[PDB]
């Protein structure tokens, strides 16, 4: 049983969980009740999976807008660093993934429609512009599952 | 048995471990073999402590030089985020601490000499300018231990 997790580490990102012979699942990244990721709630979400130790997690490499201030670059690195630290500390095998990696394999901005096509049972969850993070997480997971025959 | 850990999260930072009725200890933050923190080695160091769950960890709030580029602010946030994520994921109780907090309680740049005075048995480890991170980690731990009678 080889699970694959895909993570969009942005503050409006998400986590996708793909288990073999099971429908896909996706989870909005929890935020504090202050736009800020909630490390405690991320840890608890991950722990609730009871995933096999060493389960592979693919994390999109955060790259910031060219037009972002100094606290904006600090914030993107903080969130990416928090996810890496959480995942490595939780026993997962962590593979950073440039956004170009999955965007290239899936014709890619159409990520929401592309995710709906690959994961029809989740299309209701990708209808709105806010669902971009859910879409990226699913595509990253799909990418990390690889091309494989039965 | 109430342990206190102090962490300077900078790339040349360090971790200080204070146990009751034991001499203090300090550890350079491990780096990759590429200036880059090594998340796997940080996790393993923390796990090797076998600390009580919920042990309190005080982490200096990373603030970057005003004169630092966009990748420089991204790097300081990444390292601070990685430490927070590692510590929360590892079950510790994490308290961020402004540098002003301990600098104010210990007359504070003289942190290396101040650390040597408070922790004489470690003064050999604070002799060089490279030992700044060790000094800050110890001061943060001393600060987090609090003022308390026997």
Numbering used by the authors:
A (entry chain A), B (entry chain A): 109 to 142, 150 to 223, 231 to 272
Question: What does the article say, verbatim?
Answer:
We first determined the crystal structure of HJ-free ZmMOC1 (T107-V280) via iodide-based single-wavelength anomalous diffraction (I-SAD) at a refined resolution of 2.5 Å and the structure of a quadruple mutant NtMOC1 (N108-S275, I112V/Q162K/E235Q/239Q) at a 2.0 Å resolution. The β-sheets are flanked by six α helices (α1 and α2 on one side, and α3, α4, α5 and α6 on the other side). The α-helix 2 (α2) from each protomer constitutes a helical bundle, where G192, G196, G200, and A204 form a hydrophobic patch on the dimer interface. Both analytical ultracentrifugation (AUC) and size-exclusion chromatography (SEC) experiments revealed that double mutations of G200E and A204E could disrupt dimer formation. A structural homolog search by Dali40 revealed that NtMOC1 has the highest structural similarity with RuvC resolvase. NtMOC1 in the complex also exhibits dimerization, and the HJ is embedded into the cleft of the dimeric NtMOC1. Structural alignment of the apo NtMOC1 with HJ-bound NtMOC1 revealed minor conformational changes with an RMSD value of 0.527 Å over 242 Cα, which mainly arose from the loop preceding α2 (we termed this loop the base recognition loop (BR loop), discussed below). Mutation of Y180 (Y180A) has little effect on HJ binding and resolution activity. Although the overall structures of apo and HJ-bound NtMOC1 exhibited similar architectures, residues Y180 and D183 in the BR loop underwent striking conformational changes, demonstrating the great flexibility of the BR loop.
MOC1 exhibits dimerization and an RNaseH fold, belonging to the retroviral integrase superfamily. Moreover, we characterize a base recognition loop (BR loop) that protrudes into the junction and disrupts the C–G base pairs at the crossover. Residue D183 from the BR loop recognizes the cytosine, determining the cytosine-dependent HJ resolution.
